Design a protein around this ligand. Structure first.
Ligand SMILES: CNC(=O)c1cc(Cl)ccn1
Ligand SMILES: CNC(=O)c1cc(Cl)ccn1
Ligand SMILES: CNC(=O)c1cc(Cl)ccn1
Length: 282
């Protein structure tokens, strides 16, 4: 079926939970043996969210190459994404090592450091220009260059230096700051505006490594971001845009990381975002 009318049919019939459970039943199951090794317990935030072995990002290190991060490669859309958990106190150096080694231009953050009175990720970037951060375990230096605070999101320019080679690179930090502590946004308008700002920066384009996107577990809000981006790109590329099937795209993405889209409300919000986005594109 088309999307917008499939949408009203699910609303009128109140069957979002049944649609979402079907997706959960059909989703791929692949091994994640490296994630579960005892030496990696303090590298995982949640015991039930792990990268598959076949798609995990490897650190260029011979001691321990493990990080909780996955490469999502969308062949028809010609887009790749790295989805990862919010960094932990003992993985902030690994996080920036990955950004460096994978040649990423942008980092997309969809959570606040504290939500619901608890810490959802480490404070992993500097908050003042004159107070830079040094990650001694991976030999990197990170400096805040500029910051632009808007009503729904903040954009930061960061300098990442590989202290071993003295090479430097400019990284863009795109921080969506207004996702509610509970539920999903009432309108997709600010989330779509944010997606378009990431696109306009070059961070999603083939001349760079894959964008790094995270929330707390790296599957819920993060899944919503890449699912909406890929569906809108396919609607632009194909002769028949009504052939784009959001449930089929989601199942393809779940071949590369488990659990993408965590609730039926997030599924409905993803439909809403793609529907409204397709009208603005033209
Ligand atoms: C759907 N996207 C494309 O077909 C495409 C084509 C090029 Cl050149 C770069 C990125 N994407
Ligand atoms: C060129 N701009 C867009 O294509 C766009 C699209 C959407 Cl959905 C929101 C904001 N900007
Ligand atoms: C019916 N057309 C569409 O849905 C559409 C959607 C997009 Cl994103 C571009 C062009 N056409």
């Amino acid at each position: 079926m088309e999307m917008e009318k499939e949408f009203e049919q699910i609303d009128k019939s109140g069957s979002w939970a049944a649609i979402y459970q079907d997706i959960r039943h059909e989703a791929s199951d692949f091994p994640s043996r490296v994630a579960k090794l005892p030496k990696n317990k303090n590298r995982n935030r949640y015991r039930d969210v792990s990268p598959f072995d076949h798609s995990r990002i490897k650190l260029h290190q011979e001691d321990n190459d493990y990080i909780n991060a996955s490469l999502i490669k969308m062949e028809e859309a010609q887009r790749s994404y790295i989805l990862t958990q919010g960094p932990l106190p003992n993985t902030v150096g690994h996080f920036w090592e990955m950004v460096w080694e994978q040649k990423s231009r942008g980092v997309v953050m969809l959570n606040r450091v504290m939500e619901k009175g608890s810490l959802k990720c480490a404070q992993y970037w500097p908050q003042k220009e004159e107070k830079e951060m040094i990650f001694e375990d991976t030999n990197l230096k990170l400096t805040l260059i500029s910051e632009d605070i808007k009503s729904y999101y903040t954009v930061r320019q960061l300098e990442l230096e590989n202290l071993t080679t003295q090479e430097t690179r400019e990284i863009l930090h795109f921080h969506y700051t207004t996702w509610p502590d509970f539920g999903v946004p009432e309108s997709p308008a600010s989330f779509l505006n944010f997606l378009f700002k990431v696109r306009e920066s070059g961070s999603l384009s083939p001349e760079h490594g894959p964008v790094v996107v995270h929330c707390s577990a790296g599957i819920g809000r993060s899944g919503t971001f890449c699912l909406a981006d890929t569906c809108l790109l396919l609607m632009d590329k194909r002769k028949d845009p009504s052939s784009v099937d959001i449930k089929k795209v989601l199942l393809e993405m779940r071949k590369f990381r488990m659990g993408l889209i965590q609730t039926a409300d997030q599924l409905r919000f993803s439909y809403l975002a793609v529907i409204e986005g397709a009208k603005f594109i033209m």
